[PDB]
Amino acid sequence: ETDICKLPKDEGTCRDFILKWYYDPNTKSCARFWYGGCGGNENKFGSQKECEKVCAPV
């Protein structure tokens, strides 16, 4: 599906931490990660449900 969903998990930098979700193409599912608030990429969603809608196969 879109190549944003295949970007690596990127915890980024800064210390304004928010728990986000990213799509893991190796499990074909979304997982949690901590984002520091700076320096991330777009494989980054506020909820598992939104990550799954955008990126999951099914």
PDB file of C-alpha atoms in Angstrom:
ATOM      1  CA  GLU A   1       0.000   0.000   0.000  1.00  0.00           C
ATOM      2  CA  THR A   2       1.425   3.561   0.329  1.00  0.00           C
ATOM      3  CA  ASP A   3       5.207   3.776   0.964  1.00  0.00           C
ATOM      4  CA  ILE A   4       4.611   6.022   4.061  1.00  0.00           C
ATOM      5  CA  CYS A   5       3.447   2.785   5.754  1.00  0.00           C
ATOM      6  CA  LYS A   6       6.801   1.123   4.978  1.00  0.00           C
ATOM      7  CA  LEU A   7       8.907   3.896   6.561  1.00  0.00           C
ATOM      8  CA  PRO A   8      10.851   2.757   9.603  1.00  0.00           C
ATOM      9  CA  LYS A   9       9.689   3.396  13.126  1.00  0.00           C
ATOM     10  CA  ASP A  10      11.292   6.740  14.038  1.00  0.00           C
ATOM     11  CA  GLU A  11      11.313   7.687  17.704  1.00  0.00           C
ATOM     12  CA  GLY A  12      12.792  11.032  16.721  1.00  0.00           C
ATOM     13  CA  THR A  13      14.283  13.386  19.271  1.00  0.00           C
ATOM     14  CA  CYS A  14      13.135  16.026  21.752  1.00  0.00           C
ATOM     15  CA  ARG A  15      11.532  15.301  25.066  1.00  0.00           C
ATOM     16  CA  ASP A  16       7.884  16.015  24.402  1.00  0.00           C
ATOM     17  CA  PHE A  17       6.947  12.339  24.426  1.00  0.00           C
ATOM     18  CA  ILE A  18       3.727  11.005  22.946  1.00  0.00           C
ATOM     19  CA  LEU A  19       2.778   7.384  22.495  1.00  0.00           C
ATOM     20  CA  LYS A  20       2.035   6.851  18.815  1.00  0.00           C
ATOM     21  CA  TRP A  21       1.430   3.922  16.476  1.00  0.00           C
ATOM     22  CA  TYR A  22       3.399   2.896  13.368  1.00  0.00           C
ATOM     23  CA  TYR A  23       2.804   0.200  10.793  1.00  0.00           C
ATOM     24  CA  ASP A  24       5.224  -2.717  10.885  1.00  0.00           C
ATOM     25  CA  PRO A  25       5.273  -4.321   7.438  1.00  0.00           C
ATOM     26  CA  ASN A  26       6.973  -7.436   8.898  1.00  0.00           C
ATOM     27  CA  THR A  27       3.963  -8.298  11.093  1.00  0.00           C
ATOM     28  CA  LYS A  28       1.535  -6.462   8.759  1.00  0.00           C
ATOM     29  CA  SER A  29       0.138  -4.735  11.848  1.00  0.00           C
ATOM     30  CA  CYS A  30       0.541  -1.534  13.813  1.00  0.00           C
ATOM     31  CA  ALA A  31       2.528  -1.271  17.026  1.00  0.00           C
ATOM     32  CA  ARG A  32       3.154   1.403  19.638  1.00  0.00           C
ATOM     33  CA  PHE A  33       6.226   3.603  19.846  1.00  0.00           C
ATOM     34  CA  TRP A  34       7.291   6.676  21.787  1.00  0.00           C
ATOM     35  CA  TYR A  35       7.805   9.788  19.689  1.00  0.00           C
ATOM     36  CA  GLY A  36       9.949  12.554  21.209  1.00  0.00           C
ATOM     37  CA  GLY A  37       8.212  15.367  19.293  1.00  0.00           C
ATOM     38  CA  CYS A  38      10.873  16.269  16.728  1.00  0.00           C
ATOM     39  CA  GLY A  39      12.517  14.583  13.794  1.00  0.00           C
ATOM     40  CA  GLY A  40       9.980  11.960  12.997  1.00  0.00           C
ATOM     41  CA  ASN A  41       8.457  10.582   9.810  1.00  0.00           C
ATOM     42  CA  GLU A  42       4.905  10.111   8.622  1.00  0.00           C
ATOM     43  CA  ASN A  43       4.544   6.439   9.681  1.00  0.00           C
ATOM     44  CA  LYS A  44       3.051   7.839  12.856  1.00  0.00           C
ATOM     45  CA  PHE A  45      -0.602   7.746  13.949  1.00  0.00           C
ATOM     46  CA  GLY A  46      -2.530   8.759  17.004  1.00  0.00           C
ATOM     47  CA  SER A  47      -4.449   5.470  17.391  1.00  0.00           C
ATOM     48  CA  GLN A  48      -4.086   1.854  16.373  1.00  0.00           C
ATOM     49  CA  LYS A  49      -7.427   2.015  14.534  1.00  0.00           C
ATOM     50  CA  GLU A  50      -6.323   4.886  12.307  1.00  0.00           C
ATOM     51  CA  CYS A  51      -2.934   3.246  11.586  1.00  0.00           C
ATOM     52  CA  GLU A  52      -4.710   0.023  10.620  1.00  0.00           C
ATOM     53  CA  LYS A  53      -7.224   1.751   8.354  1.00  0.00           C
ATOM     54  CA  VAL A  54      -4.489   3.580   6.465  1.00  0.00           C
ATOM     55  CA  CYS A  55      -1.860   0.859   6.288  1.00  0.00           C
ATOM     56  CA  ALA A  56      -3.140  -2.662   6.886  1.00  0.00           C
ATOM     57  CA  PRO A  57      -3.709  -5.084   4.039  1.00  0.00           C
ATOM     58  CA  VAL A  58      -7.206  -6.229   4.992  1.00  0.00           C
TER      59      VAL A  58
END
